[model samples]
Target chain A: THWAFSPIQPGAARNMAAWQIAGKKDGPYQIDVSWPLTWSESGDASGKSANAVYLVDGNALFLTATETLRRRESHRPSETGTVVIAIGYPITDSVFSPRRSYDLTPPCDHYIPPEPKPEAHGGADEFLTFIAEIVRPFVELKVFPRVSFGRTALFGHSYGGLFALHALFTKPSSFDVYLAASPSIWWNNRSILTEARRFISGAALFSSAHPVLRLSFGSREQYPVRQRVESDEMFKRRQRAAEQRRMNDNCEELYSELLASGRLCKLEVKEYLDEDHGSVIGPALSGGIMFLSNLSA
Target chain B: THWAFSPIQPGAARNMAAWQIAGKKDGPYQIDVSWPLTWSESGDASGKSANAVYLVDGNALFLTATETLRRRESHRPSETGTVVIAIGYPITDSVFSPRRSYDLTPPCDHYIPPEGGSPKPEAHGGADEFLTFIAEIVRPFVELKVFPRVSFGRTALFGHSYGGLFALHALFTKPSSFDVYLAASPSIWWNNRSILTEARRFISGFSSAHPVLRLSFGSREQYPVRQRVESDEMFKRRQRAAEQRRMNDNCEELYSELLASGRLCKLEVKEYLDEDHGSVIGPALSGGIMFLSNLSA
Candidate 1:
């Protein structure tokens, strides 16, 4: 756990692979591995209790995290030895959609008739299948050099968070842990709630092992008063607050549904005070790291 | 300047020649070059304004800074493109010493009184030439070989403790060499404070060039008064207050000398509150990088 806080040694070799999946033929990405120094001294993670973490929006985050820590020591509290595999789209701003150029649409068919548009963007099912079948095996065989796969974790923020939820409900065994922050769950007319309902009330009970899913939200994300109103500044602030409040409500509603289903064993949740949709990432990521660290500990 | 904060792309080859002087017989060291990602892509740093900053305690500090940044994203604010040449000692820790571990000592002959007890356990006077060997020969050769040479006069120098003393000496003796200088917790008492005399004389006849130098001191480095001394503390403190104050005064005295001389075009000075003799290196080094950045604007 503490190893994560340790800065990675510089000049590490690239032991990763360049990946291109069939569904998203438009984009090709290289997965970078920030391996520990000992990973080399021992020449492979063979016989070690090593694990891999798939980061949604990884490369840009690496640059972001690296640069942030470079600013001051006080801001960062610690590090981990976990290997991070940030999945890069290299194609679009949307997170983890099967089609690299569009959004990750909710995969469930049943929705409470606020009727979603004619699948404007989605390929989540294909994307998840591609990762489980292709990426994971390649990572194990080549990058880790046949190192036994241990518990795996997945993390994402915003739309990436939405993708994380989709994975949890659609394929319960994809990863041992899932950390989602500021997930954009309001996509496709709040359609993911339908999947969450089906999984918690039905399919979840069928799986023998419950994957640990920790969800987080920013404190300020709960409807910041609109900066100004259309007329009565007060009423306008209140009106726009609902716009942001929708995601806040979405996260909480999903959390409450898990609690009511009693399958809450699959879940953990946190709310970062004073953080917003954007500002919550740092602490949220660190908290997610701590959660993952505690699991293997 | 701030570019020093940016992660240097790693895995570079060093093409520098080894050096040995006076009776120092053994010679060999693996000098590392930290290249940027662009270097690999472009194969050369041309039509570019990239710069390099050299560090004295390179390897250990690199790990510390890297790990520190690794701890949290909020702390590391940003990065710069400046390449850092962390001077690898491969041979000794006696660096920046007035003369210890076989000559971290000054290469000058102006120290007053006592005749220095016949140079015991000390090489006492070869550091200047050692740095000259490193800066003039090693740096230029490997730099041009492995990395493209930046504007020569723009390089920055940094060091702590005895190393800091070396930066100060290098400033006055080889004045125009570096555009920026960072000295943290220097041993002002070395050679009975001979450098101050030299600095005073040097500044009074100060030339036109205005180099950027920022001097820093750890906060706790100031005389730590014995807590609860008079009423009930047992043996209040082990180290005498005067002993610590002496170093404090040494730093300030020189600062004041520079300040009073009115030709203070050579540097800036600071004290890192709550930091001490051993722990000030990271922030000081980063601060130095920040200072370098701030100067560019």
Candidate 2:
């Protein structure tokens, strides 16, 4: 019933997920592999690898998805020895779970779902804490011991896009590169941009290094398309007009602003035509991967 | 390094490939799955599945990639149990193989490589024979044996480039075989654009269930695309532009004629801006799957 856009699981990838599922009970991400069997419990670094891209999603989906991008051609040769550190967010699947919504965003004031009650609205702060304070350190030290900190990138989509963008705004020093697709810049009434302006202008302060950013949007998503309307078609036609172009325009504006501020070193814009919000994620994600891989090179 | 995009090898998939590689004399596609134990094997249509999409590609890549899309919930989901019959083109992995060129293309005369002599003419265009092989041997066995209890919700013929060209040829002549036809950047220039003539003829005598055809092109090709540029890039630019211009013009011509004929119940044309010739495959494949899944619903 759920949906996702990750690489197709190859035999090796499928095997890994199946093993993690069948062998481990808790979940996929929970099981940490420390290379050649490290002491304490983190295992070993078998062979220290440098390049890696860290991520946050469900453990099951991570395993399934990682295999989706794996190939039998390690012998195929590439400059970088591909490596990744994907910390699992607390969820059943990465296929758009409600919890994912809360975890991928920060807890803001008075943010509640119209669907109402009991369901948590904004817990992005705590989730991010888990990622920044706990996940990153654990992954860097335990899972991927030899990975060069500079040789790292962060990626997310939609809310996750917001998540990555938020990290760029707040943490700043976490990853070397940041990639966001269909970013919910509309979030918090564009609160992030407010902070970004000040931050890039040095009015606001942060740590680590100035990282590059990749922002993307879909052509259809640029404008709200009336997918379902009971005869009263052209629904929300005018209300969401900015959504079509404004989102992109804002990102472009933000890119220009950041460049002017001399903070953002590199920025890439990807606008996918014919792809709506959801369908655009795959291309965006892959594009990010491609860009991220070329970071160190 | 020659690379690919497929799911990681899961334990199950790994075993299959290992068996095929170590035990079998040749490769995966060489051994056909005739459902259950049909005296030779076993056929246990254990599960009642919803939809199914038939495909043609490199062997292992087909199942792995199909499974990749299977996990992604098509917004256009109908009923339960959706499956596919991906006929891999054989050889090692899905990474482009010389043999694939031969099987995926229709036999033609004097089809020479840009930089070669004869070169065995591996690309003899034996597409007709290949399709015949599938209809007579593969599908019947797969249908009766693989999913005896279950039935198909719909069928599709999907291919990229040469394969895409062959898909149109097949659909134009044998529309009954599939409910949908997805041709991604078909070599519209191949063999002097003869496919359109067949398509035109077929358009004149079309009927029965309304069939859907999705024709796609890369934007770079729309204006001639090349990754690298030089100082005297005039010719490079012109060459690329001319190449893409011709390809796009041909497809667009076909697209217009197909629609004007009013024979197609549904025709979708997509132009991917960020992609060029080779890079367009991933988006095209995933996009095709999305379109086909929606059509059935």
Candidate 3:
């Protein structure tokens, strides 16, 4: 027998498959799709249709989301026979793409103080269309044609969260559930809110297709209980900017406004106490996957 | 080109490799390992060693631990270049192993209540042998056989649920197994709380070994919130089981007992509010990695 150390390449997640999909507008995307352990074991999707949860930032979140689904399914096997679809970049060196800022953020003329102009800032409309027209059909028709889909959900964090809201506001019927974890609600002077208002003014808010929204952020995203020992003037400045962003407050306000406006939309909000912005992603996703899985019943 | 959906098999985790090693005492064991992205990209181990974290139940927890490390390292790249070694079974049909009940539990005379749901293994109480396998077979294979060029410094052991029980056993019996012990949702109720007796004996005996222990569990583990549609009888049975297990209270008791005894050098306890037993693994691993990382230097 031959034995030697080998490198584990990207897109090697268990019960998952990977592909490079070229979008008409965007250059290309790295798509990772995972099925239930049962699907992987038996290859028997005779009459099975999974509740799909589409995750943005697949480069970063794919493994976590897939593993979370697997863990949840292990406990409650019946509730966890869901598929996970991750839309990520093809790059391996970095978990994030420079294009994410452009893809995740909505177009707006408004800008906050002290920010540099980006080569590309907002193309969320194009990105959403790519997901709807190209990504969905590829996944539903080509990838798992044998396995149908019961309900579809979307999960995102930070700017990705911002994109989840964009999908919900503009195309309410794109998915059944929207899990926006630490959404950048402050982006472009709250441009997402403008769309929210537009959606509310229209009859879409009252429609049955109005997606269920689960909003969450770390408590420390707004107020840090403890500053880092290495905190300096520069760190304080960043903290002030985060305070201005008001991630938690913005999410809660959206949750409240959506609920009180007499809209028949399902909504829930949470502030993970003691979690910092980056640290909150795992907990939020863990909770969000459960939230998405529970909606099937 | 033609395309077809492919199944993601076991040992498919990114930047990871899988192997089957026959233990001297136990049967054959499966090992999944991952290195830093930089190491994978560069293949350079010159004058570099990783702070290794060994995970029990690789099939269940490997992807989560690896992704959590990647997320943490993405923020602090320099700090996150650690190796993840997961000890799991080769079985693909299930996330758990019947052998785990035997491997994870310490030897005891207390009678284990026969439960219909949790299928009893042919044997129970093999933590000592399991720990020996990890130390002699798994660690040496990873450090000396697999990646001889890459050294290992400041090792930590992480386990969850029954695996957590084994981590505690290792810490109490063989204190030098690892520098850190992370027990997430340990089955302290196992074998009539037999681990508590081990703790007492451990405290009584004098040894130079003093390792850090991070004990964590979900607040909801002990007493879950009542379901809206659940029947009174069903809910009461759950409540009764929870009360008897006393997961949270047991963790608290262990923490206080260890602290008061002054047997341990460093100990920290975390209660994740509203998180269930399965859902807490991600957060616990995320936090535990940070805790282990900070201890270096």
Candidate 4:
């Protein structure tokens, strides 16, 4: 069938529950969804808050976010071909919200206002669990049987991209491919960098190898502070200035460290020169699709 | 300034009088807002509905049934591109409800069921006002200033095809050079085949017009009354059967009429053997695009 399943909300509501099927009954379907890790205050809040997952059936891809539990109950069968499910999860805030603070943090108080207090945070583990249990099972039962395991992709952006990295590191065999774009390696004071190091050092301990991890970041991300302040004025200008300095420093360190580790066996890292932190979602997605298509070749 | 001006919902008391601007402070930008239409079970019950217009400056298309006047106040300069507003008006029950009694008749009985005395039905002006509003106001305001008006195309099923023909006839004088697509039959019973006669006569009117029209029907569309009755087995099956028969016969007649017209126009008419009335929307849209693109070239 040529049904293109596009999620109504691709940011926070990127889970299975947020999408609606569109296109022809027998179609060359396209799933148009986005995952923005750090949403612009004037952009998408869900991109900062949600994670998205996509599954493909025939030409139809079913998309859903991470938090959504129930599947949409429409039973219009396509007569021409198979049905594919593409799931999108909210990795940050709502896709439309323009702030990335909530999505990039890791249960810490690094960028809180004066007299910072430890806040309730780091639901990444639980969020991933929700995807693995509730979201994945539905796909397995309803969609995977139709399309098989070879054509599945899990996509994340920014911190959501960081989570995709975590999933690949922890359970590399879960998906055939993983796409992490402009991942927030600076989160929790470069904790993701530290995690990557640990995974590389302990690679021999894994029983199975990791899946393909495609890592991409914008070149302008090297000037994180200026870009952040330019795009988002509501952020504490001085505080974000300091954080951007730290992030810029950490990004270089992390890139060098990853390259030195030489642990990227089936990995690819790309740096987009013209794009910045806020402008890499589209190219990243297109790159991910190209990567997946190449895998089939 | 990409801010969305939206009306603040009157609180529980329904007396709030302020309109608010929803946007992030990073200079207002163009974003998509989804305004869900307000629908009621009754005709004149005036309780405020749960429906609310949602506006967010994010990357999506903004569409609404009726223009939300408050949005004008929050209008701001777009950072990325022009603000596109898509307006969708609720069609009469004849077009929407699962019955054809109203749409098929020239002056159908406006029945006021017990639940809601059909609050004096709005005058059915045969799509004239709607087309005019789109051509004169909506299209010019958006396209000319922001997005340029390209070729226009029309794609509709049998009953809707007739409506599309009327729209084409109405706008044939000014000749805005827009393509038209008539899909899966046209009801020609209205005004004793006036549309067919118009097609035969209007060739001289636009002999040099740079537009294309595609007409398509299905093989099953020519079934006998009983066979049509068996195909559509709902409560108003007989009514639908009659409408289908009338539309199919008229479509067959119009095909020959167009051939005889000899206007030196670009036209394509086909009867897909496998498709039915409902199954032809997709093919028609796709085919119409190809036809328009060729004509534009």
lDDT of 1 by residue, B145-250 (tens): 5455444336777777666777787776766667777877876666777777668667756365576677888656655533322333322332443363366677
Rank the candidate models, highest DockQ first.
Answer: 3, 2, 1, 4
Quote the RMSD, in angstroms, for model 2. 8.3
Scoring only the A-chain of each prediction against the true A-chain gives TM-scores of 0.74, 0.72, 0.90, 0.57
The positional error of residue B241 in candidate 1, measured at the CA in angstroms, is 22
Candidate 3 residue pairs in clash (backbone atoms < 3 Å): A12-B12, A15-B8
Model 4 bad stretches (over 4 Å) = A1-119, A205-207, A224-256, B1-297
- Top lDDT hit: 3
Residue B253 Cα positional deviation in candidate 3, in Å, after optimal superposition: 1.3
**lDDT tens string, model 2, A1-297?**
111112222322221221131121222223212111111223233454455566554331242223223322221233344444554422221223455566677666545342233454465666566656655675567455655545667777777778888888877777778887778776656656755765675534555367789998876776655543324434665435445436666667777777677777788888777677656755666567656645554
Q: For candidate 4, lDDT tens digit of each residue in B1-297?
A: 121212121101011111111232321112122211121212111332211221111111121111111112112111111122322211111112211222222332332211112332432323443344345544454334322322213311112343334433432333442434333355455444454445555654544454444566655555422332134454245454545356556666665665576542565676644334443333333333233323321
* Candidates in order: C-alpha RMSD to true structure: 12.5, 8.3, 3.6, 19.3
Runs in model 2 lying further than 4 Å from the true structure: A1-50, A58-81, A84-94, A109-150, A203-208, A227-230, A233-253, A293-297, B1-49, B58-81, B89-94, B109-120, B194-197, B200-210, B222-245
Model 1 chain A, poorest ten-residue lDDT window?
Answer: A1-10
Among all candidates shown, the one with the greatest TM-score: 3
* Candidates, ranked, lDDT: 3, 2, 1, 4
CA error at residue A253 for candidate 3, angstroms:
1.1
Tens digit of lDDT per residue, candidate 3, span B1-297?
133233332222456677766534545677878776656533455567788999988778778777777777777766737888888776665677778878888887766752434634357877887888789777987888767888677899999988889999998888888999999999998778889888988888836787889999998889887755567987777777677778999999999999998877789999988887777888888878877887764
Q: DockQ for model 3?
A: 0.36
